[PDB]
Enzyme design. Sequence first.
Site, PDB file in Angstrom:
ATOM      1  N   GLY A  29       0.821  -1.195   0.000  1.00 53.76           N
ATOM      2  CA  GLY A  29       0.000   0.000   0.000  1.00 53.76           C
ATOM      3  C   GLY A  29       0.858   1.249   0.000  1.00 53.76           C
ATOM      4  O   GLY A  29       2.091   1.190   0.003  1.00 53.76           O
ATOM      5  N   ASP A 160       4.536  -4.575  12.146  1.00 54.26           N
ATOM      6  CA  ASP A 160       4.858  -5.380  10.959  1.00 54.26           C
ATOM      7  C   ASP A 160       4.946  -6.870  11.296  1.00 54.26           C
ATOM      8  O   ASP A 160       5.967  -7.526  11.066  1.00 54.26           O
ATOM      9  CB  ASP A 160       6.163  -4.914  10.291  1.00 54.26           C
ATOM     10  CG  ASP A 160       5.973  -3.667   9.427  1.00 54.26           C
ATOM     11  OD1 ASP A 160       4.843  -3.130   9.395  1.00 54.26           O
ATOM     12  OD2 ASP A 160       6.952  -3.227   8.773  1.00 54.26           O
TER      13      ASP A 160
HETATM   14 MG   LIG Z   1       9.387  -3.780   8.385  1.00 53.86          MG
END
Ligand SMILES: [Mg+2]
Length: 344
Positions: A29, A160
Amino acid sequence: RPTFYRQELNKTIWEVPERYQNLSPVGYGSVCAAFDTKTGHRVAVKKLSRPFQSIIHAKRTYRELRLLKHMKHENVIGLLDVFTPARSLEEFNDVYLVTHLMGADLNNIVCQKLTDDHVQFLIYQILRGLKYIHSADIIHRDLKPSNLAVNEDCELKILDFGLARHTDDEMTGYVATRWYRAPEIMLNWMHYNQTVDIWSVGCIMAELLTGRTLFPGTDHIDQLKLILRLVGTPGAELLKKISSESARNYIQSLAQMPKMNFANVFIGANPLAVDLLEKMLVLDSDKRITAAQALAHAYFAQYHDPDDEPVADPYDQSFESRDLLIDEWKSLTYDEVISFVPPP
Ligand SMILES: [Mg+2]
Ligand SMILES: N#CCC(=O)N1CCC(Cc2ccccc2)CC1
Ligand SMILES: [Cl-]
Ligand SMILES: [Cl-]
Ligand SMILES: [Cl-]
Ligand SMILES: [Cl-]
Ligand SMILES: [Cl-]
């Protein structure tokens, strides 16, 4: 329904509620920084790219949204808002996610070696977030300095999460994408569990203390040799747990080596930090210290508070075993978007 406005930003059309102002690109994105007039926060807004282009991609979109809606902890990334300009499922095509703006990671703060008090506080916060994550039976799988956000006050958030299998080329050669990975997952020795994240914490902690990568291998096998030189070659107890007979055969081709003395590796470090590293960097994943156990280790005596280290609500991941069509994954995603309740 809020009023939406449109604008083009670096070849991308963005349609967002009026509450989000002064959008500015910062970098799956596209991501913009913005000011949220409702809460007064500086925020990051991510527009998903092609969220429903295949079955695999639609399921991944649903996976990420379910995860971000669940995580509610000071040391873990959370969701301030999620929205779509669509007024119905039939016209639903785009998904936007909003969280706090986080402009620096652990690298930017740290080839540098930190004071022991800074290391205590940073690793304490990683372990406090991990106790929460692991209590919901979630495995992060990709802990490393670039996935840890840190601010000016040394406050830290984990982000993440591993949301998809990494590509083979991403893990090849002299790359930080592999240097923090537990050996059993790097070489596919066995079915792994949440203990892989504790291996990564040990690699991060060592690097904060020394200023140097702990296992900077030039490939998978060079990295395994670096690991076994420090922690020793496996004995028969662990070899039996390695399900691949070929991986077992390779390991037995290597000359046996004893575990090294960590006080002679981490010269001058706090003896309590040396002790904790010995309990994290254990080859047999069954025997590694857990996050809950590590928070009670004497190294963290200045920060540990058992009444302020919360666990997570249970987390139903049964959808992972489900085979659905694109339109079914997309309808589940739409339901999760419109049911979102913002935090207080
Ligand atoms: Mg990362
Ligand atoms: N500056 C800068 C970078 C930055 O602020 N961070 C790293 C990128 C994530 C992207 C994101 C946004 C919403 C939901 C999930 C993930 C936001 C935080
Ligand atoms: Cl608005
Ligand atoms: Cl957050
Ligand atoms: Cl849309
Ligand atoms: Cl990194
Ligand atoms: Cl759930």
